[PDB]
Write a protein that binds this ligand. Structure first.
Ligand SMILES: O=C(N[C@@H]1c2ccccc2-c2c(-c3nc4ccncc4[nH]3)cccc21)c1ccncc1
Length: 207
């Protein structure tokens, strides 16, 4: 396990998301499903030129998995996944520029719900989660686990968990007062409201 420091802009956005009073927390789900949909679009588009890109899995889907015992909500996709370089470097570049643009927009009067327009919608996970664990497998790299409970750092390690084939799992370790996001009726309501037209099958798992 390697530990890394967030750059100042992203650390400030994470604190803003964690500290600001904002009741419309449900938008986190739309943001993570949109990220998954974008990753699925990417691998699907690559497979049009190279069909072997799907040798790691032909199914293109999104699963939403609640676990009441562990207090986790997991968003699983079979999209392109992220390499180690994406996790540490490339997405750090995106997080920096997107945070700067988002912070400028917020000062102008934009809403926290507009976060996705800035390419940093993933960070909306911190509206409901105390810790986010990301398990990911890209065709060009090994399976990795990225994790952060904010506080200015994140970790990255090779993951020894169940091999995924290809794709990403965003595991939300929910805050104690955010357990409504584990309820079937609540997740179904949110998906219908914000994610009804996503071009991949979304399966809401139950317990
Ligand atoms: O949401 C996704 N990716 C996430 C995403 C989207 C935008 C910006 C950063 C990140 C990010 C990061 C990350 N943020 C950082 C800030 C500073 N330094 C390094 C960083 N790495 C780590 C794991 C997952 C994601 C995604 C979901 C499904 N498939 C592909 C990507």
């Amino acid at each position: 396990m390697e530990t890394f420091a967030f750059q100042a802009e992203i650390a400030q956005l994470m604190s803003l998301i964690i500290n600001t009073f904002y009741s419309n927390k449900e938008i986190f789900l739309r943001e993570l499903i949109s990220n998954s949909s974008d990753a699925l679009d990417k691998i699907r588009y690559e497979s049009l030129t190279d069909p072997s890109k799907l040798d790691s899995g032909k199914e293109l889907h999104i699963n939403l998995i609640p676990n009441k015992q562990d207090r986790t909500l997991t968003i699983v996709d079979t999209g392109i996944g992220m390499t180690k370089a994406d996790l540490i470097n490339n997405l750090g570049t995106i997080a920096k520029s997107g945070t700067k643009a988002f912070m400028e927009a917020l000062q102008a009067g934009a809403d926290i719900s507009m976060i996705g327009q800035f390419g940093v919608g993933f960070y909306s996970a911190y509206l409901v989660a105390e810790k986010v664990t990301v398990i990911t497998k890209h065709n060009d790299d090994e399976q990795y686990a990225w994790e952060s409970s904010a506080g200015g750092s994140f970790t990255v390690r090779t993951d020894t968990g169940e091999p995924m084939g290809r794709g990403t799992k965003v595991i939300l370790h929910l805050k104690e007062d955010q357990t409504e996001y584990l309820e079937e009726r609540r997740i179904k309501e949110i998906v219908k409201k914000h994610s009804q037209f996503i071009g991949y099958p979304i399966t809401l798992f139950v317990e």
